[PDB]
């Protein structure tokens, strides 16, 4: 036996079940059986995402959209509130208007990530079994991938680390989720680049999976130099969470990361007969699109189109956009010099191909973001400013 008396469950014990059945009333005391019926639905009818997420954070009335009353019970030394309007420059009538277009809460999110992980494991096993690594370009494998694809992960890590201030100072519950998910996407991208490098090392003898050479290239080589600076200016330069999200996901990322991952590695990997990099660039692109949807919904709809604080927010958005676009151009101009380390291919490596890729990236950015907030941009000027650093 045991010292503690065994507890008899009331669901199955006869006497306890009889007593409970006697106590329970025979009719319901209320008719409203909808969880949080007072939440305003964005779409036609309330969704489980809205019911579970909205109004989680207890906010006083003096913060826009609050319900509780009174000051905070405990504050920082000197009197700084736990949450307040002093943590950002943008104003709004309600902070609870943001809804994720993907309607993501924890369970579907983790389910999709687990799916991707297991599929990746199966694909790696099959690829190793069939021995497809033989039909690869040797120079591209041992001189470009191991030296620069392993250096891009530091950019990924910096962009991931930039999200802690946004996660702590954010003033709504729906936005706190989107930022956390975005940050998790970035760190997952970095861990794939590392996993792909390790997997390649495990097949071809003489391949080094250490991060010493990529770290040295990231911190010393001029090619990434300018880009590095930009990351620092986002990591520790600023503390406004709105500015951090706008600079790291709508200006710097959408141009530089798109050009680096899609227009250079993904395309030239196919051109030079590599069948492994696209499998990871596809996941990176999917994560970027998912994050882009939420960022666009948050900024274009809720803030830049506020009924009363429209122009006030637009002014700050333009002021940040011009500065960070200048920084991103300088990074792209510094980076575009990598084209001298690859064999010439007509239409993909010459000046015309680079110009076409830059025009595509800048036109996509102008359509997606700049036209929504009223920013004025001329692609030709940005394109030839970037190509000024291209060597023939």
């Amino acid at each position: 036996p045991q010292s503690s008396q065994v507890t008899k469950r009331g669901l199955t014990d006869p006497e306890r079940a009889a007593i409970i059945a006697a106590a329970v009333p025979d009719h319901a005391l209320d008719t409203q059986r909808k969880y949080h019926y007072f939440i305003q639905p964005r779409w036609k009818r309330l969704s489980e995402y809205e019911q579970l997420s909205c109004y989680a954070q207890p906010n006083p009335d003096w913060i826009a959209g609050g319900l509780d009353w009174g000051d905070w019970t405990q504050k920082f030394h000197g009197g700084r509130p736990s949450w307040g309007n002093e943590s950002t420059e943008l104003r709004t009538t309600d902070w609870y208007r943001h809804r994720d277009p993907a309607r993501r809460w924890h369970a579907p999110y983790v389910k999709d990530k687990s799916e991707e992980a297991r599929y990746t494991q199966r694909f790696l096993a099959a690829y190793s079994s069939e021995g497809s690594i033989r039909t690869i370009d040797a120079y591209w494998r041992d001189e470009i991938l191991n030296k620069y694809y392993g250096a891009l992960l530091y950019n990924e890590y910096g962009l991931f680390n930039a999200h802690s201030s946004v996660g702590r100072d954010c003033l709504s519950d729906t936005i706190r989720q989107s930022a956390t998910f975005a940050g998790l996407d970035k760190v997952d991208n970095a861990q794939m680049i590392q996993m792909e490098r390790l997997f390649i090392a495990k097949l071809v003898p003489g391949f080094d999976a250490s991060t010493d050479v990529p770290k040295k290239i990231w911190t010393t080589d001029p090619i990434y130099a300018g880009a590095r600076g930009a990351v620092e200016e986002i990591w520790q330069g600023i503390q406004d969470w709105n500015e951090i999200l706008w600079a790291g996901h709508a200006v710097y990322d959408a141009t530089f990361g798109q050009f680096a991952r899609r227009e250079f590695f993904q395309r030239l990997a196919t051109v030079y007969g590599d069948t492994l990099t696209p499998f990871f660039t596809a996941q990176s692109q999917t994560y970027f699109q998912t994050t882009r949807g939420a960022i666009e919904d948050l900024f274009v709809y809720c803030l830049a189109n506020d009924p009363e604080f429209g122009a006030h927010n637009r002014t700050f958005l333009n002021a940040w956009t011009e500065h960070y676009l200048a920084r991103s151009v300088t990074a792209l101009k510094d980076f575009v010099g990598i084209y001298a380390k690859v064999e010439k291919v007509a239409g993909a490596t010459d000046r015309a191909g680079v110009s076409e890729a830059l025009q595509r990236v800048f036109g996509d950015w102008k359509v997606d973001y700049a036209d929504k907030i009223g920013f004025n941009i001329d692609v030709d000027q940005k394109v030839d400013a970037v190509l000024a650093g291209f060597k023939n």
Partner: protein, 166 residues
Amino acid sequence: REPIHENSTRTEWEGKIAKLNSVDQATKFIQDFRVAYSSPFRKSYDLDVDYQYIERKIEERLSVLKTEKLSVADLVTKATTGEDAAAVEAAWIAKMKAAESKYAAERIHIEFRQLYKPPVLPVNVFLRTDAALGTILMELRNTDYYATPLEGLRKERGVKVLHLQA
């Protein structure tokens, strides 16, 4: 009294707020309001349960007045009283460093928070200075926490005891 969310005190104050049309006048108004009703060392407690809402309204009005008569450089690297943001930070850091007692450092911190708070000062400059001052304040207050007896602590603070159960 009156309902929590809708009281005349708020209507009156909003009505008198709405007639502001210059940056300097709004800055003087917000500084006076913050000094009068927004500290443990406040002059009056009559507006206790409504001062934060009024402060929010004043902040919104001042922010709307800004971004209409100021340049981008003024909005970013210049305080709203016409002084550069960087100097202010250095001067107040030096003032806090020169402090010698735990009762003067808190006064300096409270005065700085009352005077230069957004949208008067840029957000990044404020947050950095606030963290820097808080570090020193914490370091000063957490030395010999349990050394002082309770009666001596009451005498030092300056409160007066009304009722004291046995």
